[PDB]
Structure formats: structure tokens, C-alpha cells
Amino acid sequence: RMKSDHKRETERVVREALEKLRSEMEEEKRQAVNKAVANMQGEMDRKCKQVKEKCKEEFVEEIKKLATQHKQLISQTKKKQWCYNCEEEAMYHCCWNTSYCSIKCQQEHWHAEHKRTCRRK
């Protein structure tokens, strides 16, 4: 009677011990996964910030180059006379702030607005 009860005894002790360990190992597993993933996240993100910000700085420097180029071109533009109708360089002077590259442009701007505004003697 006892050679049977000892066997049953042992069996149930084994069962509940294995269930308890299995559960423990399950959420120990889940936490190990959480740790590895949370660390890996940060490594990836950090690398990402580095590359991205290097690119952003290249962009800023390029923008500043462009701005400088524009400044110089503004000055050069300020040292020239331009057709008011189209925006090619001017060769004919009508009156104040009103010059033209050609007679065609002169006529166009004339009929468009300059007729009512020409201050030429």
C-alpha cells in the first residue's frame, strides 16, 4: 500500500515543482527578452542620432554656402541696369528705374503700365 503511495507522492511533488519552475523560467525568459530588446533599442537609436546629425550639419553648412553665394549675386545685381519688362540686362534708358533690353520690351511695358507712369521729359 505504501510502495504505491510513495510513488504517487513523489509524482505529485515532481509535478508541482516542475510547474513552479516552468512558470519562473517563463517570465525570467520574458524579462531577459525585455532587457536585450531595451538595450538594443538604445544602441540602435544612438547610432541613428549620430549619423543623422552629421547629415544635418552637412545640410546647414551647405545652406550657409548658398546664402553667401546669394549675397554676392545680390551685390552684382545691384551694380547693373536691368530691363523692367523681362529681366535681361538693359541697354535703353527711358526714365527713373525704367530701362529696357529692347524696343519690344519697351512697347510691352508701355502698354502694360508704363504709359500712365513715364516721367521722361
Binding site: 535703353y92 534708358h93 513715364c118
Partner: peptide, 8 residues
Amino acid sequence: SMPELSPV
């Protein structure tokens, strides 16, 4: 009425 312009 359009002024006659010459090249400068």
C-alpha cells in the same frame, strides 16, 4: 506717345 529711345 511712346518716347523714342536710343541705346546708351
